[PDB]
Design a protein around this nucleic acid. Sequence first.
DNA 1: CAGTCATCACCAA
Lengths: 305, 424, 333, 333
Amino acid sequence: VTDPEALLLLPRLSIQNANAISSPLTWGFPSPGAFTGFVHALQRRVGISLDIELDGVGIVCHRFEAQISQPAGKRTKVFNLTRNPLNRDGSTAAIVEEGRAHLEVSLLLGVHGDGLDDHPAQEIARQVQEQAGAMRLAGGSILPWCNERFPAPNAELLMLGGSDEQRRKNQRRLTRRLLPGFALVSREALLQQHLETLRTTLPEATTLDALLDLCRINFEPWQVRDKPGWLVPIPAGYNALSPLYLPGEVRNARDRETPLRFVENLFGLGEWLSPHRVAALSDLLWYHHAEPDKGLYRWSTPRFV
Amino acid sequence: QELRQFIESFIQERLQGKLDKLQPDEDDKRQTLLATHRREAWLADAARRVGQLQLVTHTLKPIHPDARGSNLHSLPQAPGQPGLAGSHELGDRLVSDVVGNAAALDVFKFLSLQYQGKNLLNWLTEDSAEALQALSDNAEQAREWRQAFIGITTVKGAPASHSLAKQLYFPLPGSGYHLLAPLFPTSLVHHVHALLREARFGDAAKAAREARSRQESWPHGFSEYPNLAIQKFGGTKPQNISQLNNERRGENWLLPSLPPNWQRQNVNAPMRHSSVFEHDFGRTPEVSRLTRTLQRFLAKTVHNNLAIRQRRAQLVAQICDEALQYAARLRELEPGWSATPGCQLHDAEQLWLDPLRAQTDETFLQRRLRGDWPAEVGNRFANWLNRAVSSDSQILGSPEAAQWSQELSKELTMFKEILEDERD
Amino acid sequence: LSTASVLAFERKLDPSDALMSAGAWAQRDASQEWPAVTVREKSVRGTISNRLKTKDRDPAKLDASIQSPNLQTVDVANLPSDADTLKVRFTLRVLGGAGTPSACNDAAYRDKLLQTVATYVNDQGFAELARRYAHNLANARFLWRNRVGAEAVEVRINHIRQGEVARAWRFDALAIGLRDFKADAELDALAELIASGLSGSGHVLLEVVAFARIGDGQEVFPSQELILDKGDKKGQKSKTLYSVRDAAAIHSQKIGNALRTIDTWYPDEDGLGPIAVEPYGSVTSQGKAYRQPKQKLDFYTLLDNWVLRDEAPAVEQQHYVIANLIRGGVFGE
Amino acid sequence: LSTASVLAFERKLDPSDALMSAGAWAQRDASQEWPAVTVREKSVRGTISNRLKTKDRDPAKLDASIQSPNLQTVDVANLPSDADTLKVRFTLRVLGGAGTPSACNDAAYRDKLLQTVATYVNDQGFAELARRYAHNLANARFLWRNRVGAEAVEVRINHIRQGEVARAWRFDALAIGLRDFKADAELDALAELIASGLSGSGHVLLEVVAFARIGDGQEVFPSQELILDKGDKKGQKSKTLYSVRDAAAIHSQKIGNALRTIDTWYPDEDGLGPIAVEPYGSVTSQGKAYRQPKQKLDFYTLLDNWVLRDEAPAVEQQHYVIANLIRGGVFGE
DNA sequence: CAGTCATCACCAA
């Protein structure tokens, strides 16, 4: 909601062994729920000793590879597993399947606090990076440096105090540091828009998302067409099955302080657009916003349109 | 009351199915007890083993091996925003899986065969007039069946969770946190799994593929799902999980959601006699679809022109950013860019998409591209991209030549200003 | 007081994936630019050499199929014919806060546990377990089959705190045995650093490089990933090796499993070498679980007696109980 | 007591792949810079020279296919016309510890197996096995089709400790035969080195160099690649010869086959030459299997009698069982 | 005489 003044680039985050299932109906790149949980986990450890805030994340995703294998006679995939230790009788344990992938990621944060005028912003950049290099980005660890120990420091720059001409040179200087990536935004208006193509059939909604991430072909009145983006099904929050429980009610909870619901996933849509296609970089940022009483929990990116 | 033969085929069918279980050493009580209690005590076994299970729509057995907890049983509500729908706005053709005791899910088939043939699946618990005439039991037996058959759809145990569950935190707008414990949508994954098994294979989705194979097809829609992934639940035995067997077999099919740029090639722009000068176009493997789209979307007229006039406005950026990504993932992304072999022609590509100076950096290395006008790659780019936006005598003489060359001019205008600030 | 129904410990001693690269010995001081060992595919003709099943005893098929061949497709990773030295490089983050769980139900159980851990720390710090972590760094145990038959092994460890090096160690890993934690002042200066990182006090980030002279063009052994039920067509691929980008590699969990071979104190037969730290302390190659709860020295029994009942075990079992907290786990009711 | 359901034995006697180069005699002791024999693809006009099916034998096509030519594309390697000598160079590690499995399920069976192998070792070493491997190194068995009709063959073996060499042997590989195991005192000095490798007494790395005087421009025979699961059109390639980077080569498993042709102890025709060490003694290229399961001389009968039921075989079959354990494999039930 | 620990059949396209 609150537009930040300065954006914080976390330039290279080579992370290993992230989760790659992310919902019961998708696989591949992890959910942006992991990224906004990561930035509020930065908020509870750094942002109070700097008296700043950090709300939104610019998910860029330079590289991607998944620990998958192509079997014989199939065009599908399976996942490469770990070998778990034995049971107490010496026999072998069962198999729970955890997909796994390596990533390389850039990040764009948003500051809102009095520490930006109480400090140099280099203090904010150094402290946020040196603490975030001891955390887990999606489900896996954040790696230290290598041959790539030259892009290690950050950058940070405001947008309100300054001229209004060479800020194009400034944000396209920023774009020189995230140039091979594909940003990930929320494009859920097209899920509305592809019901009118099915309005001749029914006003149903659950099979509309399963129409866009594939190759639909009819014959000549072969029918291939340019898909209008890199449009992919992402998960987009939780919807309540069960009423809110008082913090001593549910057996085997993580906490004895917070209240608990039983929820399940809701599915949206995204696109892997290059950052050139959007003018202002503050459009990309992902935010948590969810109303508590009726149980709809959701994350999206505002300011995209 | 001609609906007791289902009870006959449930009792005597299983009793005759135990004909391969022949042990001539110690069956002298097992065979007699099986013949006796397989019929009469089968109602007792289906009463005592009718209370180990429950109906579900939020199972947790499919998220951990032995996570003994409480499974949900009600559908989620409607999401109040526009543009995102899931396991609550699904249709009224839902199917509740039956999680419970793995060695007790055989009486569930005899209890749920009443939704096959007749319409008396809702006659066993309530409306036992469809369970008095062909049941052939007394008041104690009819009451015991109507009591034991209510423990499926109702609650089985206490509402709880487990240590192997997820239970995420969510920040509230101006408050603390709620714990969100997500569940596995067994009903939704059954619906999408049956939906995709008729879309990847089946009658029409494969007969249209043979119609393509006979090269004579009229328009009819088939579907193709490339690069999925498979996940197994349970393992060698998936019947310990809820049903997962009717046509699931522990194989929920996962749709791909990958990033675009995670399967790249290698950057080889060396000092070659054509790998320096002939590499002024950006010959990549992912531009064939864009060239084919710009070709095959140029023949339609403006008789349906309320949608096709909003795609070439983004294609200039969608082809210029490809050259930007190539020149910034090959030159700077590669660790080297040497002098061109046959430098009288292989030097302009080393000027435009080239890295910084190196160990062969003499005096005149940071004094040519640091002061030379970096605006010569505009006309060559317009000639290259204007070869895929080809001119025609029926295109230049028509009113589409200016309306398709203005886009190439507006694309070539800004790329020189973008790439004229790296050195100069 | 009851045991907490949700316990979960974040791991410490977090390693990366190893990377393999080939070069020559005494050219190993300029080894920042050796080329990476790639995974090569090959197909293989062989013989039926398994116990055939007489369950379906056929006097026609199972005797002639002994005579007929067996065609398979595997992976392999070799050194080049002009390289005799294998280089393996990874990094190791040590975190600290080695007694604080990531999820606990009651804060009273948390208060009963955290002062027990601090009572363990103040009288005898993490130095005595950091010695045995620093040993398994110093002798190159993470080279699993790559040490077997190697002639000279050298392990280099660099403490990095900034852009560049702070402190550097050199070792001869074959002079340091796999069974005998004989401490010496070359690595007690490493053990104090790993202990001061496990406390939570100072920064620690190691860079571990291991050299192993093997032979010209020999076969090195990167990690093989479990692929359960792949290739129902018989034109399949049996062995599949693990590769990070254009390099042979070892999984991170295998390197961590090599680093936490600490347990010498197990009560079945202690004179057989240190095993990996596990609850119900077991070993998958041996096919057997040492440290069985009938002989009440596993992790659940000792943790409950030492937190809930204050029955302190011996110091040697306490090192095991703390090593399961550096290892981390997921516990329940 | 049963055998374990999982057994894995690592290979001992692990060779690399061999690479081919060419030159002339009297330069064979300055042969370090010979150029490699290269792989060349050629195209062949030939003749239909197979049997003809009578199941759809239409004489319009079948009687007319004979008269018309046959076009095939193959691969061939030759010596240069300047040179007359093949050179083959590979390395060989001898590991030791050849009775201890690397994966098991039982512990009692593991101790029974280790004390059985120690019973074998501490009354007779590996010397009968080591001199048979030294025979197969001393003649040039590993040159498979290349030595056939070769005029003179010389085999040089070097023992390597560092950059410098420690011990050197030279031989006449045509005086030593393929069916005898008659030796001299010079081969026993190699047999004791291999037997000190197999018993873990020392580190053994060997460099085996074989020269074969064949002829000017004659054809050499590298190993042929098994190309599996193609599904292609009319044979775009029908013979692909194995090479490494710009050098023709032999697979490591074919040299490994040639070194372990040790078995002269098989029942029917033990006077008719040694065969390789397999569990079921099968020679696949000759289409039969010595050591059937019916005559109780295969590995899965003798192993189970000798380890479990204390039924020690004859010594000549004990050599077969220990050779199968130097080999390796999956010997589980 | 009552908790608890290893085993035991129960299912299952």
